[model samples]
Target: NFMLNQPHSVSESPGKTVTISCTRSSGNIDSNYVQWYQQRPGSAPITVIYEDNQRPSGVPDRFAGSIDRSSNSASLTISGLKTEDEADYYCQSYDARNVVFGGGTRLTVLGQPKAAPSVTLFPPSSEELQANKATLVCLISDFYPGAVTVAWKADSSPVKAGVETTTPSKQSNNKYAASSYLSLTPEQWKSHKSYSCQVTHEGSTVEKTVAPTEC
Candidate 1:
């Protein structure tokens, strides 16, 4: 009659330690034994920790699990994290008559230098303006780890209206790409001297600007 709730994601650098937690939605967490599974991309999940704190054979000793009565949660801790340890992890346990599984958490191991996104800005076409509206397009590409933020600017001021952005899409080469759009009326478009698209990735930011006459 209970479910295991877990964080959506966790991140840590290499040689560091990270812990993923699964909290019981209801009932005592220690009543049942917990199991932990590691699932890599496009691969089946494997048992990493079973019976609450036992590691399976052939698994590394860096992985450990424990339950905390005070928090009503179970935790899986990995020490000296490696790049290969990056994957989705889940915790499972049982109720009186049903098995319960956590929502799972995405584990990101950041060791190498992050890949920043390349930004490209495109002005609205003539036809779009004739229709009484304009659209600015921003293309972001070649980013790693797929975490990015996009912002639009009009004459160097932040503009928030009519801005839409897509989530990162994986490319064929394992990189990430995304797009953002800014909609404007023909009058507003003509009034703004310049519009810019800024992409923030990791600790770096890339800005691309376009004028109304850039077409």
Candidate 2:
């Protein structure tokens, strides 16, 4: 595996704080080499945390990092969040002379929330696993710094089988009332194909894809 962590993205609004969850699986290594990157709209992924907790000289003090060896995990945090902070956060690591990145998460800031958007798979397919939401049933859950966009793609394009995108409804806490559903039928799921869920929050795009399997 190039990377060793479950890449998770997060969101936060102005005057708030947000943290991105990252966990690695490379032996007993600690936080010394773990770092974070933030890629904003129309920009490249920039180093947000480097060398474990060391914020790049150009970044604001609102950003920070942490490492834990026991759980094999690392994290990135943001204080006094702002609309401009809406973007994708990725986890990266190093060993010897090689480095790898985890799935990644997208943070979207919203006045309340916006409706879904059209489908397009190219700019890397929704970061392939961004945000704390979505699973098969077009499942969308675990919203933090939430309200990121959520769309579906099958075989790398827009899709669904009896797919349903529900309104961002509330359930758990005030973490934003949000949930959705998009499931395939026996025929659809039985096809020898693949599926993907894309979420666009703010100007950032993040997603997760699934390939079909047979029992």
Candidate 3:
């Protein structure tokens, strides 16, 4: 029932070092052997570290793994980072009953230009608003250095319930894309004067808003 949680993303420049940490939500992380995998675009994930800290054959010595008993966490550190090291990293551990994995972390090598995503908001159709649930979609596309924060607001007030956001995925164009959704009851959708999807990227926040009248 426990989960392994990792940072959503990490970035470093070439010839630098970066460490990605995975924290166990409930059990002692040391109770099981931890493994790390590296997944590149359009390729299957390959094991980088296994059995807590063992680097597999052919993997560069630049990759390493360690555990911190005090923090109940595991870490995968990479030194002399290269542009080819830009990929998703995941930490995994298993118990007798089940296996668990941390949500993969995106590693961005800063040789490319960073760009902000274009924000678009789509309100549920008027016909759908009359249904049981009204869903709002926020499209975030064409961004670089992919980490972004997504938030939803109704009538200018924070709305937390029924909101979900996806991890950014790399596009063929070399940018990133992601989506955030807000679900509301028809009553809530109609009562709010406006709904906004706010995305923060590269120290700037871009937002798109929708009103009931636009439905």
lDDT of each: 0.87, 0.63, 0.90
Candidate 2 residue-wise lDDT, 1-215, digit = tens: 44565434444456888777777665444734887888886898888888878987889998889877777788787888888888878887876677777777777665453433333322212333354222354445444444455667667667634455665555554444343455444445435377677776444666765564422
Point to the candidate with the largest TM-score. Answer: 3
Each candidate structure's TM-score, on Cα atoms with residue i matched to residue i, is 0.59, 0.53, 0.72
Q: What is the alpha-carbon lDDT of model 3 when measured against the actual structure?
A: 0.90
Model 1 residue 210 CA deviation in Å:
24
> Could you tell me the C-alpha RMSD of candidate 3 in Å?
4.6
Weakest ten-residue segment in model 3 by summed lDDT: 124-133
Candidate 3 per-residue lDDT over residues 1-215, each given as its tens digit: 68999877788889999999999998998999999999998899999999999988899999999999999999999999989999999999987788999998889899688787999999887687667779999999999898888989998889979999998899999899999999888888888789999998754888888988852
* Model 1's TM-score against the true structure: 0.59
Task: Give the candidate order by descending TM-score.
Answer: 3, 1, 2
Assess the local accuracy of residue 112 in candidate 3 as a C-alpha lDDT between 0 and 100.
Answer: 83
Candidate order by decreasing lDDT: 3, 1, 2
